[PDB]
Design a protein around this ligand. Structure first.
Ligand SMILES: *[C@@H]1O[C@H](CO)[C@@H](O[C@@H]2O[C@H](CO)[C@@H](O[C@@H]3O[C@H](CO)[C@@H](O)[C@H](O[C@H]4O[C@H](CO)[C@@H](O)[C@H](O)[C@@H]4O)[C@@H]3O)[C@H](O)[C@H]2NC(C)=O)[C@H](O)[C@H]1NC(C)=O
Ligand SMILES: *[C@@H]1O[C@@H](C)[C@@H](O)[C@@H](O[C@@H]2O[C@H](CO)[C@@H](O)[C@H](O)[C@H]2O)[C@@H]1O
Ligand SMILES: *[C@@H]1O[C@@H](C)[C@@H](O)[C@@H](O[C@@H]2O[C@H](CO)[C@@H](O)[C@H](O)[C@H]2O)[C@@H]1O
Ligand SMILES: *[C@@H]1O[C@@H](C)[C@@H](O)[C@@H](O[C@@H]2O[C@H](CO)[C@@H](O)[C@H](O)[C@H]2O)[C@@H]1O
Ligand SMILES: *[C@H]1O[C@H](CO)[C@@H](O)[C@H](O)[C@@H]1O
Ligand SMILES: *[C@H]1O[C@H](CO)[C@@H](O)[C@H](O)[C@@H]1O
Ligand SMILES: *[C@H]1O[C@H](CO)[C@@H](O)[C@H](O)[C@@H]1O
Ligand SMILES: *[C@H]1O[C@H](CO)[C@@H](O)[C@H](O)[C@@H]1O
Ligand SMILES: *[C@H]1O[C@H](CO)[C@@H](O)[C@H](O)[C@@H]1O
Ligand SMILES: *[C@H]1O[C@H](CO)[C@@H](O)[C@H](O)[C@@H]1O
Lengths: 207, 163
């Protein structure tokens, strides 16, 4: 039964981080007067976990943005290549956003290029699709939400060669259609482009 | 403004794990972007990262157990010093409403009908049993439901006749 008291508000541990905030500790361990044989104990508060403050911000690694919109599909010195069998090229852009304070840079290629045919504003033959899956209730949490499924006039893409050769090497590349065409089809229920149907949503809950 | 500062943001749960200390300002705790903060300790565990949209929650239960209903799910713009995609301040929720259908069976329980008349006693001498029977068909039960109680009742009858 040796009476134990408190030692120092003890020697400081160094701030364990070179950036931002960290947690040092000293506490006050029951070391200069140790309770022995299981008698009394050290009375008070032994807790010190201290917030050390380093005035240097930490590096943050930059994250990728979403992929942009596809550029118009043209070819150099070939007028307009719309509705023809002339393969062109198109581009898309991203943005490395958020890298500050000597952080790591974005890992990857920032540009995406593919070969394309230009189908922008070209008249095509079409066929009516079936009823799509029922959409969400719009507007949610507002006055009278309604569902929406639709049959749209899907264009029939022309049977062009799906690959193209390269001049420098014999290996071939993909071709992918791009554009907003004007599909031609017979009418269904008084519409030429898209016929939809709205049904209101039942038992709308509070948000 | 002093705010409780945590050491690790557990993603996909929204919970602030590993407590560092309290009373530090928001500009000092978020110098390390792997941290998280919590004001007033009543909720809203926000990470120190740039404001990005969190994951969509699971769907709420269907507002009715029968026929077509509606269910919600929310998403909270988590982050600090920035705006989410669409000029959205941090802390704003976004909901999505979809129609659900739990089952196609409705009012499974059924009520009792009118009681039938009393049958005569089961024996003409000594004692026996006497029974009334009713039906469970006003309205009829659907699916594997059943009428509450018993389908028949029984009591004794005395004929006052020596065998
Ligand atoms: C140009 O675009 C086309 C797409 O329009 C792209 O085609 C890709 O083909 C590969 C290989 O066929 C596909 O990978 C498949 O993945 C599925 C699972 O998702 C597997 O089941 C497939 O295995 C079978 O098919 C092989 C041959 O097709 C067999 O060898 C194999 O034993 C199995 O039978 C296969 O692994 C891929 O899904 C598509 N689509 C893409 C990548 O979007 C083509 O590669 C593109 N060309 C260039 C140069 O980029
Ligand atoms: C001290 O100097 C800073 C400039 C950084 O380079 C520090 O590195 C940091 O170490 C911790 C591990 O404890 C990582 O979590 C950080 O990502 C990293 O920035 C360095 O200690
Ligand atoms: C959920 O389970 C179902 C089987 C019903 O018991 C629901 O009760 C109520 O049934 C009426 C139909 O008469 C519906 O209008 C409602 O779905 C509900 O109020 C129960 O909620
Ligand atoms: C009704 O009237 C009585 C006077 C008897 O004649 C009955 O017949 C008796 O029925 C019981 C059981 O049903 C038997 O144990 C007797 O053997 C028989 O006499 C009658 O049904
Ligand atoms: C662009 O590419 C695909 C979507 O087409 C995804 O990996 C991602 O959204 C990226 O931004
Ligand atoms: C380019 O590619 C298609 C359009 O053909 C879409 O997924 C999108 O508009 C993208 O920017
Ligand atoms: C859609 O329109 C009519 C049906 O009304 C048909 O000519 C054809 O099925 C088209 O795809
Ligand atoms: C919610 O929406 C879908 C999940 O269906 C994903 O794009 C993503 O997880 C988002 O948080
Ligand atoms: C909501 O929809 C169903 C549950 O009804 C599941 O696919 C999933 O849990 C989603 O969050
Ligand atoms: C049987 O019991 C009495 C007749 O003894 C009446 O309350 C009623 O006719 C029932 O069916």
């Amino acid at each position: 039964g040796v009476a134990g008291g408190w030692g120092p508000w003890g020697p400081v541990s160094p701030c364990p981080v070179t950036c931002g905030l960290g947690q040092t500790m000293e506490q006050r361990t029951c070391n200069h007067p140790v309770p022995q044989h299981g008698g009394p104990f050290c009375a008070g508060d032994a807790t010190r976990t201290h917030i050390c403050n380093t005035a240097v911000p930490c590096p943050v690694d930059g994250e990728w943005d979403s992929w942009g919109e596809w550029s118009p599909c043209i070819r150099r010195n070939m007028k307009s290549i719309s509705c023809q069998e002339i393969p062109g090229q198109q581009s898309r852009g991203r943005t490395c956003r958020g890298r500050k304070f000597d952080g790591h840079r974005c890992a990857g290629q920032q540009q995406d290029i593919r070969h394309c045919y230009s189908i922008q504003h070209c008249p095509l033959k079409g066929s009516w699709s079936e009823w799509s899956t029922w959409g969400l209730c719009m507007p949610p949490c507002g006055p009278n939400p309604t569902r929406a499924r639709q049959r749209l006039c899907t264009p029939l893409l022309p049977k062009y060669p799906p690959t193209v050769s390269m001049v420098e090497g014999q290996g071939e590349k993909n071709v992918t259609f791009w554009g907003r065409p004007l599909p031609r089809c017979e009418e269904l229920q008084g519409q030429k482009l898209v016929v939809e149907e709205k049904r209101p949503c039942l038992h709308v809950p509070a948000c | 403004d002093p705010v409780l500062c945590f050491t690790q943001y557990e993603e996909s749960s929204g919970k602030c794990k590993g407590l560092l200390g309290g009373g530090v300002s928001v500009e000092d705790c978020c110098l390390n972007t792997a941290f998280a903060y919590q004001k007033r300790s009543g909720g809203l565990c926000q990470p120190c990262r740039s404001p990005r949209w969190s994951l969509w929650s699971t769907w709420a239960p269907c507002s009715v157990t029968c026929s077509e209903g509606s269910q919600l799910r929310y998403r909270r713009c988590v982050g600090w010093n920035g705006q989410c995609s669409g000029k959205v301040a941090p802390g704003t929720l976004e909901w999505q409403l979809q129609a659900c259908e739990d089952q196609q069976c409705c009012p499974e329980m059924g009520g009792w009908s009118g009681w039938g008349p009393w049958e005569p006693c089961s024996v003409t001498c000594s004692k026996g049993t006497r029974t009334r029977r009713r039906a469970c068909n006003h309205p009829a039960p659907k699916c594997g439901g059943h009428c509450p109680g018993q389908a028949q009742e029984s009591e004794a009858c005395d004929t006052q006749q020596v065998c």
